[PDB]
Design a binder for this molecule. Structure first.
Ligand code: I87
Ligand code: I87
Ligand code: CL
Ligand code: CL
Ligand code: CL
Lengths: 695, 697
């Protein structure tokens, strides 16, 4: 059920041992010594990774190392499509802007932070959650020249439990992290977007990196003189596999959860956030799909934009399914009613006052939040010409010196980036007509961005005419229209341009709504500090975990499938046979790598197949994970690596608010499948040889 | 693999059935010389199965089987199709015109008699051995002089089995006064609607209730207010004990057709011609139709039924091609024929190998013609609505060329034009469908093989299909209402003779008939070779584990209540529940609306004695019985012969089961009798129907 702090391992250890954990507590996490925790990294700011060799080899997801694989891909060596396998360490590719973070030490600094906070005076101060304020406290505690006396090391203080607990992290950051191996995208991204959030899953979602450092193992930026890192700890690879009900545990960096939402916040999340995102994205995607299916050239230009819109659309559908069917609202209502009854018995009304302040803030910001999501989903991300060029103050105060030619070159560069090889003005006019028709039906005239008032006032309610006019008269409506403006540029032409006025008008409303809504966050945050303090004082810190905040957490559960619906059971494990069942050579998402298909036909599974002779691919577990847990190590009862977490089923996405024991699962790529691909597909034996593989 | 056995085969199967769980005595299930459970099974309205469930002639069948009767009695004031129907007294049961129920009174093996009569061979290539006219002359000769007059209600029929190696005579008793008694609302009767057709898990309460009426002596009689309910020889007892995984289950019914003795070349032909063309052409047709229906709500109303009708055999062809691709159907037919050929070589008889060779040679020779036939049938005949536009008859053209018969000819042509261009016809949607369908057709069928009018695409329109179609509608008398009325005011034979739509329709129907007539002669050598082929198969491996092909005659099948794994890591259990109906509820999707009375029964758990041991309300179950079209409405029996459900569908993964039974995928989809009784009770409130049934604890 939870995403536990490392400090909470002592308190959960007996429950974990009862659930099957065999390793000693301090071998998993030791606050004053080397432990398994030391082999876990924050990979490139938002993923998790793990050290799997004494030479700094790192495993993470294919989708986590995707940008690095793509940056090294060319028409001559397309690593994204064919995979990449460095046959020697010297052939491993450096990556600019990459990092791996080790959590060297973790310390509870609650009393220190709370004592420092007593000097505030203003009760409503938000310094208790300020990264700038907490960094000044972290620097004071670590010392004046800490990073100079301890190179590669840095300190950070974070708030937990709404500001009721503070931890200081000492981090070791390495920035020379090289690409070592990757399967082809047909394996690494087998499901592609069709299987995203889906279980059963048949994706070999892994990539391999290596941490490099100076001669002493200290962090150093890229240098040809850097040597592989010999770490304090690395994971042993298990080849024993998994069976149903086996104990499994994960360490990683879950980003965000909302476990302490009031019932009113669940209602708001459903009725505003999710319903607007679902309604607006379905309109956008519907027009886009019609156009992509009618023209193969439109499919090429819009495939990535369509897939990017679908990802959070599916998340919102899964989240709304949980609100509708798993009683999330009701369970938050029961959680807050229990605290209110306990507060009434203790003679302390502050918990009931805190829940009331959250409800009153939610109810007061309702119309504004609705207007914000409507413009963000409907226009800001819904219509491409909302992000068309807006001339700066510097650019107009140049057009009306020879700096007129420089202003036009800057505007031209932005026009060329908006109307790029993937932009269709015709598809965008169609999407805008459907999106604005919905937007104009939902947002009253007095609440519209100023330019949108022209639909009723100037165009007699004809949205199609309004959109046609924007393109017909705008300097960004076509290449010929821009070039005619660029030849004779007037600031009066730009100031009256229908597309400039639309873009300016919608961004002005988006910012005015953002600025008006920002003040409502603070009373809710302040009330949550009191609310969570009451919850913890009443039921304790065990069963109720602190919300995820991109910090190192552990979660434990079992390898177990689930029943998605009446008479249907999804087991705990998928096989290579499932990849072959899904093969469709004329659908790019489900093409099968010929070397992999041959391994399957010949049953060349070696030491990686299960006892039945079947090749496993992926498994699922009752661990509690979220975004940020991509690439996380999945451990055995003995702490040996059995897989990498890479996704979670859509039925469990409401698990960020309420864990769903009968539906929520972490989707994990089996480590045996990872090794079979490195071995029989990549032929990269040296990587197998440097890992410590246990029989 | 698993079969559809003749009643005659119950004796030789009985010990296997008993070891698989059957508890009832052989002659209680079927007895050729007495009353048995076979006497409670009926052929319902020519193509469904039904069963008698009371001593007062009450009959259960599917909702989709009694659908036309429920619809014929529905009005805006009493919409029985939508709200259900529950006659609260026998006098309130509604008569139905053109309905029938057929009882299989006697079944007799007449093989020796038919084979002796056949020896009077004028031609050794005669097809009389399979002729309904010839076999009826033999049935009439055996039954006697005016048998129908001496035994009113009874009739005799002889059918060929095993490709003409076995003949059975059936004595049938037909009743034509069959009244509507009860039906759930369509939201229960067709809950999955087209989305869940061929789908397991399934949550549909697919049942309807009728009653057989007869004269005072229980003899068949057409509808009369003086008719009384039939007291039958036998009826099914209803079980409330339910089902559990691995329980024995058996069915009796009338499966229509199978192709269990196809050669490997016939499987290849079925895949590469029949199925690939139907799939390719229907996907083009459906794709254009769906885009138009999604862009215009009025087009969705007009084309929903045509779209759904096209999809049904399209999904069947996809499921059948999945089996050919993944279950080795071709290979298993090849192994079946190679084994017979090896055994024939050892026996010194080359006739079996010669028979398989004749089938292969006939299949290979008719390939181009059969491809051209399926291409025109799927592509144009079925694919394009203006192919079925009016064609003036020889008598209509003669009437137009000096009498009052001119206005008679115009009124007949007008009636046909009005039926073609009806409230559901869109000329614009049809032009779009025709442009996509003809583009595919013209790419597949060479110029010299085209219907004559289609040659104008290359010759007159420079290959522009859109211009050719636009021209058909712009210049045709049937292109619009105003164009027809202008023709009707000044009709000339010459206008009709040069009409582009008339020429298109005539041209495509001429080619369709020429292909049909050229292909028909190839059926006979295959049929004659199959008589020898199946004779060899039976002489070699016996009439024990190879059943005769289905031919709309009474058969039994047995298996177990068991689910299956459709794909890697996915398991579909053997039983669905009322919770599955509630999970599927979508009030703004007509297919998945839930009846408010049913939703209340679920919320209150008002399941009575109908719920399972765990308090869950069962809906449907699936079994390893071997069924096909014609088995809708079939009784599903317990090990004791008690009714446990009604068969109503089969999963798409098992549709290849008409050629090769698929033990790990093929299932019969059955509505649980506990759910039927729950709906009659808590939804219909029709207690009298429960009271007349014999319900066993
Ligand atoms: C194949 C596509 C079109 N979908 C039906 S889906 O399975 O991806 N589905 C996953 C989650 O529920 C929906 C939001 C979409
Ligand atoms: C998109 C898919 C999942 N279908 C809804 S389907 O109706 O096309 N399909 C159902 C399974 O059996 C096939 C023969 C047809
Ligand atoms: Cl380290
Ligand atoms: Cl012979
Ligand atoms: Cl099978």
């Amino acid at each position: 059920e939870g995403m536990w702090l490392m400090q909470q391992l002592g308190r959960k250890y007996a429950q974990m041992k009862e659930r099957g954990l065999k390793m000693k507590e301090y071998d998993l996490y030791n606050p004053n010594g080397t432990s398994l925790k030391d082999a876990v990294v924050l990979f490139d700011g938002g993923c998790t990774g793990e050290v799997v060799s004494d030479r700094g080899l790192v495993l993470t997801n294919h989708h986590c190392g995707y940008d690095m694989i793509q940056a090294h891909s060319t028409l001559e060596h397309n690593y994204l499509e064919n995979g990449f396998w460095a046959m020697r360490e010297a052939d491993e590719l450096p990556n600019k802007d990459i990092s791996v973070v080790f959590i060297d030490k973790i310390e509870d600094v609650t009393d220190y932070v709370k004592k420092e906070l007593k000097a505030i005076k203003d009760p409503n101060s938000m310094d208790y959650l300020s990264p700038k304020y907490l960094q000044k406290l972290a620097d004071k505690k670590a010392g004046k020249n800490f990073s100079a006396k301890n190179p590669g090391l840095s300190v950070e203080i974070k708030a937990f439990y709404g500001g009721n607990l503070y931890l200081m992290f000492t981090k070791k950051t390495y920035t020379d992290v090289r690409l070592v191996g990757a399967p082809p995208s047909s394996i690494g991204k087998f499901g592609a977007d069709t299987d995203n959030w889906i279980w059963p899953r048949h994706t070999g979602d892994f990539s391999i990196f290596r941490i490099y450092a100076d001669k002493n193992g200290n962090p150093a930026p890229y240098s040809e003189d850097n040597v592989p890192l010999k770490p304090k700890r690395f994971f042993n690879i298990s080849l024993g596999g998994v069976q149903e009900n086996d104990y499994a545990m994960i360490m990683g960096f879950p980003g965000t959860t909302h476990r302490y939402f009031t019932a009113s916040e669940v209602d708001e999340w459903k009725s505003i956030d999710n319903d607007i995102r679902i309604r607006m994205r379905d309109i956008r995607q519907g027009v886009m799909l019609r156009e992509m299916l009618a023209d193969p050239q439109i499919k090429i230009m819009y495939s990535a934009k369509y897939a990017a819109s679908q990802n959070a659309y599916k998340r919102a559908i899964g989240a709304n399914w949980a609100i509708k069917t798993r009683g999330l609202r009701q369970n938050k209502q029961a959680m807050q009613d229990r605290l209110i009854a306990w507060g009434a018995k203790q003679g302390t009304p502050r918990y009931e006052e805190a829940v009331h302040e959250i409800d009153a803030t939610v109810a007061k910001r309702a119309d504004l939040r609705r207007r914000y999501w409507m413009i963000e989903e409907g226009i800001i991300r819904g219509i491409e010409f909302a992000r068309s060029p807006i001339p700066t103050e510097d650019e107009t105060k140049a057009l009306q010196a020879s700096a007129r030619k420089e202003a036009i070159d800057k505007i031209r560069t932005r026009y060329s980036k908006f109307a790029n090889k993937d932009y269709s003005a015709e598809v965008d006019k169609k999407v805008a007509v459907a999106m604005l028709t919905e937007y104009l039906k939902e947002i009253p005239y007095e609440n519209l961005p100023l330019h949108l008032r022209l639909v009723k006032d100037r165009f007699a309610g004809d949205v199609q005419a309004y959109v046609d006019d924007i393109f017909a008269r705008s300097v960004f409506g076509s290449e010929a229209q821009f070039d005619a403006f660029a030849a004779v540029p007037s600031v009066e032409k730009l100031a009256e341009d229908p597309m400039v006025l639309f873009a300016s008008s919608v961004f002005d409303e988006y910012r005015k709504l953002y600025n008006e809504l920002r003040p409502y966050d603070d009373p809710i945050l302040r009330a949550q500090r009191t609310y969570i303090a009451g919850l913890l004082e009443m039921d304790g810190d065990q069963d109720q975990f602190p919300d995820a905040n991109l910090t190192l957490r552990f979660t434990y559960g079992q390898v177990k499938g689930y029943s998605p619906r009446d008479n249907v059971y999804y087991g705990h494990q998928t096989t290579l046979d499932g990849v072959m069942e899904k093969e469709d050579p004329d659908n790019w998402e489900f093409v099968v790598d010929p070397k992999l298909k041959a391994v399957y036909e010949r049953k060349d599974f070696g030491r990686y197949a299960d006892r039945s002779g079947r090749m496993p691919v992926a498994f699922c577990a009752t661990t509690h994970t979220t975004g940020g847990n991509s690439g996380s190590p999945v451990m055995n009862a003995n702490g040996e690596l059995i897989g990498l977490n890479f996704d979670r089923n859509w039925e469990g996405v409401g698990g960020d608010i309420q864990y769903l024991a009968d539906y929520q699962r972490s989707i994990i790529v089996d480590i045996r499948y990872v090794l079979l691909v490195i071995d029989k597909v990549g032929g990269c034996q040296r990587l197998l040889d440097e890992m410590n593989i246990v029989p």
